[PDB]
Design a protein around this ligand. Structure first.
Ligand SMILES: *CCC(=O)Nc1ccccc1Nc1ncc2c(n1)N(CCCN1CCN(C(=O)CC)CC1)C(=O)N(c1cc(OC)cc(OC)c1)C2
Length: 290
């Protein structure tokens, strides 16, 4: 691998700590970094480091190099997980990125479901829920302006910082578009087919509008506080329902403005779904009202 001085970080300034999970064609580990900000060479910060499995082969490496190079290109934004540095020289390949303190948005929301003075005031309020959606839309708009189609956008792929800033994750991955087992649960027991636009699912076609569809599913997850899309519906039935043009019901405690937005995102024709710019504006006006 070539030396890229703009991104290279001394591996000995890293102290690897607890694993965060895998399935990425490698594995992600919490770490402390010293001098990530060169103005303060001895200061510690908490980061996340992606690396290969210890029994990985050349295909996994190519993919990790690829995701690295993608993250170099897309540049920096508040509402995405940002690249911090890389270790490519004299040792294993490390990709260093921001670490979000509160985990993924799905678990964030599910852990904060209200009770079934402030006795019925749960942690999550409507304006913060709308802010969560607005931030995801902002990040996706940025990703779109950098020619990046996410292809998996879901609450589990949104990370939450200590200050409750949404950061879109896993946007630089090779998805294996042409060999998806629609029936197979992932590491969570999650079925990613439930986030696929009709054009991607039936015609293997991905555009930025395909991601808008996924955003509408993600909207539904937010306002069900981390619910599972198409609740109780086996994948076999999902195929039929989608061919029949069926859509999810309006969730309880969800204003018609936001179910409206969901339904627009799930328009069968990609050209009749909102753009992320439009989503950003529509959510911003809601955020302004409340
Ligand atoms: C920072 C404090 C902390 O420990 N946070 C934490 C704890 C528990 C779960 C998650 C987090 N926070 C977190 N912060 C930053 C990143 C991650 N997590 N990643 C997710 C790890 C968990 N798990 C990994 C395996 N997996 C996959 O499907 C494969 C990725 C499910 C999730 C994480 O992977 N990060 C990440 C993101 C991106 O986005 C482009 C790219 C990376 O490497 C190139 C790494 C960061």
């Amino acid at each position: 691998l070539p030396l890229d001085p703009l991104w290279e970080f001394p591996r000995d300034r890293l102290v690897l700590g607890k694993p965060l999970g895998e399935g990425c064609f490698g594995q992600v580990v919490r770490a402390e970094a010293f001098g990530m900000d060169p103005a303060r060479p001895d200061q510690a910060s908490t980061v996340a480091v992606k690396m290969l499995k210890d029994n990985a082969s050349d295909k996994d490496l190519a993919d990790l190099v690829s995701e690295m190079e993608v993250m170099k290109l897309i540049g920096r934004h508040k509402n995405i997980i940002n690249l911090l540095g890389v270790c490519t020289q004299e040792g294993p390949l490390y990709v260093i990125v921001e670490c979000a303190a509160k985990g993924n948005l799905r678990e964030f929301l599910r852990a904060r479901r209200p009770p079934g003075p402030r006795s019925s005031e749960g942690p999550l309020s409507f304006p913060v829920l709308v802010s969560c959606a607005y931030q995801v839309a902002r990040g996706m708009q940025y990703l779109e302006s950098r020619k990046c189609i996410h292809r998996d956008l879901a609450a589990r792929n949104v990370l939450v910082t200590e200050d409750n800033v949404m950061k879109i994750a896993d946007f630089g991955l090779a998805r294996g578009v042409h060999h998806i087992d629609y029936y197979k649960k992932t590491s969570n027991g999650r079925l990613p087919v439930k986030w696929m636009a009709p054009e991607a699912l039936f015609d293997e076609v991905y555009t930025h509008q395909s991601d808008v569809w996924s955003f509408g599913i993600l909207l539904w997850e937010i306002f069900t506080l981390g619910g599972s899309p198409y609740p109780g519906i086996p994948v076999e039935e999902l195929f039929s329902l989608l061919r029949e043009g069926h859509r999810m019901d309006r969730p309880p405690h969800c204003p018609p403005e936001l179910y409206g937005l969901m339904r627009e995102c799930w328009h069968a024709a990609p050209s009749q779904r909102p753009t992320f710019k439009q989503l950003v504006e529509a959510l911003d006006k809601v955020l302004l009202a409340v």
